[PDB]
Amino acid sequence: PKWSARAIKSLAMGELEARKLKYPSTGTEAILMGILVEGTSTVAKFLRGNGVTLFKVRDETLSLLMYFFSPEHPPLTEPAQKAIAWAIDEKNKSDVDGELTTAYLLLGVWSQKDSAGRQILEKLGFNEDKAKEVEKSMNE
Ligand SMILES: [Cl-]
């Protein structure tokens, strides 16, 4: 359970993005946006290179989701929770030492097949080959 600095900034950026945008909860789409707002990790550059950018993610999000009753603190959705749990679980069995980077967080969103993050990623051109490609990057 040792989070990289860029993973921590990402989540923080995701939750703040959820408040900025007046969302009733903080979901997988915020995690994904959090990574891109952070923007300096290996996986963020990878996404940005394969046509997945904040602008397009922000856009693809409206195409999914008025909202005038959102709480001051948008709680994590169950899929967001499941994506973070997935990142923990994958790292605790990786049979290697290391911190859990933003790539684990991205594969966590990707592992949640009903999630808004899963959808948006596909809608932008992300696929299983690219996920094995990121999973290869996370191991070098
Ligand atoms: Cl990282």
Swiss-Prot record:
Keywords linked to the UniProt accession: Chloroplast, Plastid, Repeat, Transit peptide
Coiled-coil segments on the chain, per record: none
UniProt-annotated location(s): Plastid, Chloroplast
Annotated protein name in UniProt: ATP-dependent Clp protease ATP-binding subunit CLPT1, chloroplastic
Subunit structure: Monomer and homodimer. Binds to the CLP3-6 ring (P-ring). The dimers monomerize before association to the P-ring. Component of the chloroplastic Clp protease core complex which consist of at least 16 proteins: CLPP4 (3 copies), CLPP5 (3 copies), CLPR4 (2 copies), ClpP1 (1 copy), CLPP6 (1 copy), CLPR2 (1 copy), CLPT1 (1 copy), CLPT2 (1 copy) and 3 copies of CLPP3 and/or CLPR1 and/or CLPR3. Interacts with CLPC2 and CLPD. Interacts with CPN21. No interactions with CLPS1.
S-S bonds: none
Phenotype on disruption: No visible phenotype. Clpt1 and clpt2 double mutants show delayed development, reduced plant growth, and virescent, serrated leaves. Clpt1 and clpt2 double mutants are seedling lethal under autotrophic conditions.
Stated role: Accessory protein regulating the assembly of the plastidial Clp protease system. CLPT1 first binds to the heptameric P-ring containing the CLP3-6 subunits followed by CLPT2, and only then does the P-ring combine with the R-ring composed of the clpP1 and CLPR1-4 subunits. Once the core complex is fully assembled, it then associates to the CLPC chaperone partner to form the functional protease. CLPT1 and CLPT2 are partially redundant.
Main location: plastid
Organism (species): Arabidopsis thaliana
Chain spans, region Repeat 1: 3-65
Region entry Repeat 2, spans: 76-140
Domain notes: The MYFF motif is functionally important for stabilization of the overall ClpPR complex.
Clp R domain mapped to chain residues: 1-140
Source species, domain of life: Eukaryota
